[PDB]
Design a protein around this ligand. Structure first.
Ligand code: HEM
Ligand SMILES: CCC#CCO[C@@H]1C[C@@H]2[C@H](CC[C@]3(C)C(=O)CC[C@@H]23)[C@@]2(C)C=CC(=O)C=C12
Length: 452
């Protein structure tokens, strides 16, 4: 069928677009190149061809077959932040990836997914008898660093459980994400002028060295113990695999890291966006308290409830459709294929633009936020906010539980207030790797007024 996209200019074809992704910020570059040519087109990030796609048919095809379970990015960047064939999020060695994902997939379901909905209510509960840590003088709570703090402590007590410094680590993880986000597609010339990037290369070793402290401890607690099988946790499952011949110590440490940053990065920023949507929508928030009062009143939160909370479930989705945090997924092709009647060579990078695709396709009212787009049981072949298949979101299940938990235990106890004329559409956002709010502005603060 032959391929859309800007003219290849004999040397300049790539050089514009790549540069454009650089000055624009990945997120918007796709959101741009997708409107200029089709919902299926081609650009050049580095040498290699790269397809940027939003047609739900193409989407589905890619996430579904196995020959697409790999991502991409500057080898030197991934090398610099630690994920060059070591993590999972961006681990690209399909055998080495395949042998690790098990461990994540394991601890983010089944036994520990029942323990989550109760450790999630615990960490947020304890940090709410402690607003003295996040509130202005004029009573403004810095919501983000509240979430980031509890989200990480949730992550700790579930997967690692080692006494740590909450406040200190939260920033370091934030400095890490910065770097990750910078060096991901910085073309190889970048990496030569060192007085341009050790900038980041130090705030990496900053977090990395700070975690090596924790796992050194978690290791000793293992080798002097009250009989092993008692208490299996994502940490130990790994360190034990290492104490066989299954895993590099180098590789463990990056996984234990990829696990603690995982929730803070993504959850906090999503729950921020929800908390702003609740404030700006007065009637929606009622429906959620009604649903709460009905199913729970003033009982403790417990596992069995989360299916019954159907309205809030609906909310969480509609936020994620309308206001994504992750709006593009990067995959790579490993075998050649015809996809949507198109020829795709192996080694082509794919950027699936799921954030646009959510406004282009199935939904009744794509451009306004309403719980209406979710009165009609949704296909999941049309609304794919986590992904699926062999390399979809490893958390996707435990994720939707945490949100349900923290969203409830918090909306239980406080009415929320935006600041002035601020809505989620009037905040100012970076749009590079993810789509997250810009923290070089102010007005990202909120006011918590009690209930009953
Ligand atoms: C609610 C917030 C979250 C969103 C919006 C989200 C979404 C995504 C998406 C779109 C991907 C790309 C996978 C694909 O190609 O389909 C992904 C991957 C991944 N997610 Fe999440 N996720 C969330 C929460 C979490 C949590 C809480 C964890 C860990 C506790 C997590 C762990 C991971 C990991 C480890 C990967 C890489 C999987 C792999 O390729 O090996 N995610 N997530
Ligand atoms: C701080 C703002 C943010 C964020 C979340 O997005 C980040 C970046 C995500 C990554 C998963 C794979 C994604 C979706 C891509 O292929 C392109 C961007 C990638 C993800 C979701 C997984 C765990 C993690 O810890 C942080 C993130």
């Amino acid at each position: 069928s032959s391929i859309p996209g800007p003219g290849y200019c004999m040397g300049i074809g790539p050089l514009i677009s790549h540069g454009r992704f650089l000055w624009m910020g990945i997120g918007s570059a796709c959101n741009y190149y997708n409107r200029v040519y089709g919902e299926f087109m081609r650009v050049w990030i580095s040498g290699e061809e790269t397809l940027i796609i939003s047609k739900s048919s193409s989407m589905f095809h890619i996430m579904k077959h196995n020959h697409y379970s790999s991502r991409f990015g500057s080898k030197l960047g991934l090398q610099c932040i630690g994920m060059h064939e070591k993590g999972i999020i961006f681990n690209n060695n399909p055998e080495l990836w395949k042998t690790t994902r098990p461990f994540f997939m394991k601890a983010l379901s089944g036994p520990g997914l029942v323990r989550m909905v109760t450790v999630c209510a615990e960490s947020l509960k304890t940090h709410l008898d402690r607003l003295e840590e996040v509130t202005n003088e004029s009573g403004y709570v810095d919501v983000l660093t509240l979430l980031r703090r509890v989200m990480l402590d949730t992550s700790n007590t579930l997967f690692l459980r080692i006494p740590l410094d909450e406040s200190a680590i939260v920033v370091k993880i934030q400095g890490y994400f910065d770097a990750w986000q910078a060096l991901l597609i910085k073309p190889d010339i970048f990496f030569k002028i060192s007085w341009l990037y050790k900038k980041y290369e130090k705030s990496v070793k900053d977090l990395k060295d700070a975690i090596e402290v924790l796992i050194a401890e978690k290791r000793r607690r293992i080798s002097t113990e009250e009989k092993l099988e008692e208490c299996m946790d994502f940490a130990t499952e790994l360190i034990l695999a290492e104490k066989r011949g299954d895993l590099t110590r180098e590789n463990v440490n990056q996984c234990i890291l990829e696990m603690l940053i995982a929730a803070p990065d993504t959850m906090s920023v999503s729950l921020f966006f929800m908390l702003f949507l609740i404030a700006k929508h007065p009637n929606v928030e009622e429906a959620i308290i009604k649903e709460i009062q009905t199913v729970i009143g003033e009982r403790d939160i417990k596992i069995d409830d989360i299916q019954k909370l159907k309205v809030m479930e609906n909310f969480i989705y509609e936020s994620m459709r309308y206001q994504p945090v992750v709006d593009l997924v990067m995959r790579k092709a490993l075998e050649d294929d015809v996809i949507d009647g198109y020829p795709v060579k192996k080694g082509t990078n794919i950027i699936l633009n799921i954030g646009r695709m959510h406004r282009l396709e199935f939904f009744p009212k794509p451009n306004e936020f309403t719980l209406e787009n979710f009165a009609k049981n949704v296909p999941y072949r049309y609304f794919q906010p986590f992904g699926f298949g062999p390399r979809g979101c490893a958390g996707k299940y435990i994720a939707m539980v945490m949100m349900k938990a923290i969203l409830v235990t918090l909306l239980r106890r406080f009415h929320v207030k935006t600041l002035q004329g601020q809505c989620v559409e009037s905040i100012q956002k970076i749009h590079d790797l993810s789509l997250h709010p810009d923290e070089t502005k102010n007005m990202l603060e909120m006011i918590f007024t009690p209930r009953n």
